[PDB]
Amino acid sequence: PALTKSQTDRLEVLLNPKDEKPFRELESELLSRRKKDLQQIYAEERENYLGKLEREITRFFVDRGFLEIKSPILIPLEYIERMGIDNLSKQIFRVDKNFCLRPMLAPNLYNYLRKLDRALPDPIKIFEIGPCYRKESDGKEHLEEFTMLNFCQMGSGCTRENLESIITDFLNHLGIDFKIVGDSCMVYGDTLDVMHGDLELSSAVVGPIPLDREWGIDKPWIGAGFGLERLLKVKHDFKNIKRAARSESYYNGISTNL
Amino acid sequence: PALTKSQTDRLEVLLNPKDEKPFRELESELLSRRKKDLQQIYAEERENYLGKLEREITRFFVDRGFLEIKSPILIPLEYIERMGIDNLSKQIFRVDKNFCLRPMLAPNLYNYLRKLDRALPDPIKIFEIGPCYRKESDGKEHLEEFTMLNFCQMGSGCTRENLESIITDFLNHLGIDFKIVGDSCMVYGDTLDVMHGDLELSSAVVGPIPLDREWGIDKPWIGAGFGLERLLKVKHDFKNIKRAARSESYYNGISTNL
Ligand SMILES: Nc1ncnc2c1ncn2[C@@H]1O[C@H](COP(=O)(O)OP(=O)(O)NP(=O)(O)O)[C@@H](O)[C@H]1O
Ligand SMILES: Nc1ncnc2c1ncn2[C@@H]1O[C@H](COP(=O)(O)OP(=O)(O)NP(=O)(O)O)[C@@H](O)[C@H]1O
Ligand SMILES: [Mg+2]
Ligand SMILES: [Mg+2]
Ligand SMILES: [Mg+2]
Ligand SMILES: [Mg+2]
Structure with a gap:
């Protein structure tokens, strides 16, 4: 019954x-x-939804003048301390004595911004899409293995208006509803958070911030980080983020246990 | 002087x-x-060379009837034992007590082959491209963080001739010179190795092999795994594989230390 x-x-x-x-x-x-x-x-x-979204996002940013980066996923532990993550610190997957799985793309992108400033014309525009890792207790809106997009611009035109414009164009392109709200965190500011209802899609920053000096950065900058699995969750109306993840249990949100 | x-x-x-x-x-x-x-x-x-190659390889296999997979990079340690890796065993990056960074794509793809056999028509054709990890002492032709392509077919048409044909079409498409030679290893066979001079580009297998039973596979199959950084090394004539890697030191084989 x-x-x-x-x-x-x-x-x-x-x-x-x-x-x-x-x-x-x-x-x-x-x-x-x-x-x-x-x-x-x-x-x-x-096509796999996660792969296809990465390709779509790649095209969007390349076409808008951003250089595609592919940087290490396994990063030095010293990058964590250097990001001001002192006792997120409990969410880090440590590997060996000297490395960890990156919890964010920021440190590698800071290094690229500094290095590319010696070669490229102002402004420097870069982005990366790839795996990131955090230990999480939550299952509904969080994964331990997720995929980040981070874009950033350094030098001229690094205004809040320009940042909000890129975000708006990007999400209207993907067809994802959003609102931009003020928030704050330990690492950066003062962020702008991009929300879909109560779900955070992105945290965005208008620099400079005092963290920059540690990474050899002394110019204005703007940037934002987005979780691809969250974007997919919203776009496809999945009830649980597990449907959007790298998975053996779901393929494009379809159960593989049939 | x-x-x-x-x-x-x-x-x-x-x-x-x-x-x-x-x-x-x-x-x-x-x-x-x-x-x-x-x-x-x-x-x-x-575009980044590693990203661009992934996209090109993706198009090749999708167009030839292979389903694109994106599966976990962090995998259960039990998958290592179940692959017959007993005391490669010393090359595994362990994470926590129960997980490791995958050293190959095989176990996840075995699981997909089994699961998809309940839904898809014969033959089942799948591929994955993504990060893999091994502790290595060698620096010239090896990276600890690399990118694998693995494709496989299960059911009808799983012949050595068909496998060699896919490999040949693939590498002629990319414009990479090669020879296919017989070799062997602990995990699989009896492999065919795809060589560029003395450099191994791929190891390929014509199943069935006795390992299949552990993964619930009881059909003929063929497959091959290729390192993308090795393909790039050969294509771009890099002297050291570090030029082809996810890196903060090289971008498209160009030093970022300028
Ligand atoms: N565990 C996770 N699973 C999926 N996506 C994530 C995860 N952690 C962060 N993200 C995404 O990455 C973006 C930027 O990272 P960050 O601002 O550090 O996340 P966060 O503030 O920890 N998010 P939350 O834990 O929901 O408050 C977030 O807006 C999410 O879209
Ligand atoms: N450490 C590495 N760095 C870069 N590519 C790799 C690495 N290990 C394996 N590969 C690639 O993955 C393919 C299939 O993996 P596998 O056959 O297990 O490698 P392998 O036999 O250990 N190669 P080698 O160590 O040079 O003899 C190889 O043919 C390489 O193209
Ligand atoms: Mg969090
Ligand atoms: Mg946030
Ligand atoms: Mg080896
Ligand atoms: Mg081999």
Whole structure:
């Protein structure tokens, strides 16, 4: 008669946002739908949502004058201290005695900004997309392995207005609803946070900040960091961010346990 | 008069493969050339070689009927044992008590092959591109953080001839010279190795192998794994694989220390 909590949980795994007693028939129907969804992907486009979003974001920023960076994921532990992360400090995945999995893209991008200032014309515009890692207790809006986009500009035109304009163009391009709000944190400021309801899509900063001196930066700058899995969650109306992650359990938000 | 070893080393950092006393003038010339190279990239294409190669490889395999996978980089340690890696075992970067950085894409792809067999028509064709990690003593042809491509097919048409044909089409597409040779290893076989001179570009396997049973696989299959940094090294004639890596020291093989 009434579905159990465990049965409802099983059906929820197989339910997709656009879907509109006995359990076995409900399960059979959804299994059929999800198999057909995977079959359609396989027959036609064959692209993974996370990969495809990375490619779309890459095109957006390249076309707008930003240099594509691919920097190390395993970074020196000293970069954490140098970012002012003292006792986030408890969220770091340490590897060996001298390295960690990067929890953010900032330190590598600081180094690129400094180095490229010796070669490139003002303003210097760069971005990176790639894996980042944090130990998290939360499951709904957080992953321990996620994908960040960070873009930044240094030199001329590094105004709050320009930053808000890039953010607005970017999210209107992707078709993601948002509002920009004031907030603060230990590492940076004073940030602008880009929100979708109560979900943070991005934290953005208008420099300079005193942290810059440690990285050999003495020019104005602006930048923002976005989680790609959060963008996908909002775009595809996933109830849990696990549907948007690098995963063996979901493919393009479709359960692989069929 | 004569350049010192240290001076020659400095000039070699700034020398690019296509380049054709006192040290200060030689250094000044090369600095100028390398700055202009970065300026040209920034003015025109703005793509990173590693990112661009990933995108090109993605297009090749998608167009040939392979499903794009994005699976976890941090994987359970049990996957290592289950791959038959017992005491490579000393090359694994362990994280926490239960996880490691994946040294290869095989285990995740085995799981995808098994899972997708319940949904997709025969043959099942999949590929993944992404970071892999191994502790290495060698610096010239090895990185500790590298990027793998692995493709595989399971079911019908899983012949050595078909495998060699995919490999041949792929490398002729990229414009990379190669020969396919017989070899062997502890994990798989009996492999075919794809060589560029004495450099291994890929190891390839024609299944079934007895390892399959552990992963719930009982069908014929073929697959190959390629290092993207090795492909770039060969394509761009880099003397050291560090020029092709995720790096803060090189961008598209150009020194960032200018
Ligand atoms: N654990 C995570 N899982 C998924 N996305 C994340 C995670 N941590 C950060 N992000 C994304 O990266 C962006 C910038 O990083 P940051 O501002 O450091 O995150 P944060 O303030 O810790 N987010 P939250 O923990 O929800 O308050 C965030 O706005 C998110 O979109
Ligand atoms: N440390 C590394 N750095 C760069 N590429 C690598 C590394 N290890 C493996 N690869 C690439 O991944 C491919 C398949 O992996 P695998 O066959 O396990 O490597 P391998 O036999 O250990 N190579 P080698 O150590 O040179 O004999 C290789 O053919 C390389 O192109
Ligand atoms: Mg957080
Ligand atoms: Mg924040
Ligand atoms: Mg090896
Ligand atoms: Mg090999």
